[PDB]
Write a protein that binds this ligand. Structure first.
Ligand SMILES: [Pb+2]
Ligand SMILES: [Pb+2]
Lengths: 164, 165
């Protein structure tokens, strides 16, 4: 098992929430973009990082990637549902429920980042991440879109700097 | 041999291809893809255009509702792509004037073809001749899997229902 399996799995788990979020927005006719909200979600995460003495700029970069990957999945689903609306899940969970699940995933993600700091900042990170991704892509039989989204979500992981 | 519906299906496909410059503009301008009120205006004008040529406006409204949804679907797919890789979004894309003119011309080509092929669009042979036309235009325009799906959605109301006995 890759030593980055937990963090790449958490990334994938957070990507799973794009679908019910999209489903809800589709039915409610809400826009996918929410620049104000994203700006603020990243604010809290930055401050959480500072509290644990985790580099906030690294954290905000990673979560920005994560959020864009999620937005990409929502747009892809809207594309599919414009082509064939019958596919749109009729009774998705409330957006507030999805957002609370996301908040909890974020906390776990940040904890896994801190736990793996020495590895994320080590030269073996690129190799370990490619292995973690390859394993999870196969084991979850992730489709093309989710493979791409996972790449985007994890693209800044190995940018961590070792402690002073 | 060429489907009698190839000219119509080719216009539909060329009109779908306008999704690309339109999406690139909306992306840079930070505009959403959708606008229900805009689409209802566009559909209303198409109905008026149909009436002017004594084409069934309800039929034209259904066909163009499908065409517009299919176009939106392409626009959303590009937005997905550009969220994953923002550097791939076309930089400093041109404004929508060319796209506007193209859509006006293609709307007119489509409507005139619906009149020209009305008997076929109403006949049992429509389904197979639509299939033949789609195959021929997918090839001639080298349409990828996204545009193949979109062309299917755009043309799904072309063939009219037949008597049930
Ligand atoms: Pb580990
Ligand atoms: Pb899961």
């Amino acid at each position: 098992t890759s030593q980055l399996a937990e963090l790449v799995d958490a990334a994938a788990e957070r990507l799973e929430v794009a679908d019910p979020v999209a489903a809800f927005k589709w039915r409610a006719q809400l826009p996918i973009e929410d620049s104000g909200r994203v700006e603020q979600q990243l604010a809290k995460l930055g401050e959480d990082a500072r509290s644990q003495h985790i580099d906030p700029d690294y954290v905000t970069r990673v979560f920005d990637d994560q959020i864009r990957a999620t937005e990409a999945i929502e747009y892809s689903r809207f594309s599919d549902w414009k082509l064939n609306p019958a596919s749109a899940p009729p009774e998705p969970p409330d957006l507030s429920a999805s957002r609370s699940a996301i908040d909890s995933l974020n906390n776990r993600m940040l904890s896994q980042i801190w736990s793996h700091w020495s590895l994320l900042s080590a030269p073996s990170c690129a190799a370990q991440l490619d292995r973690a991704k390859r394993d999870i892509v196969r084991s979850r039989h992730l489709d093309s879109l989710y493979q791409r989204a996972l790449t985007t979500a994890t693209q800044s992981y190995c940018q961590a700097l070792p402690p002073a």
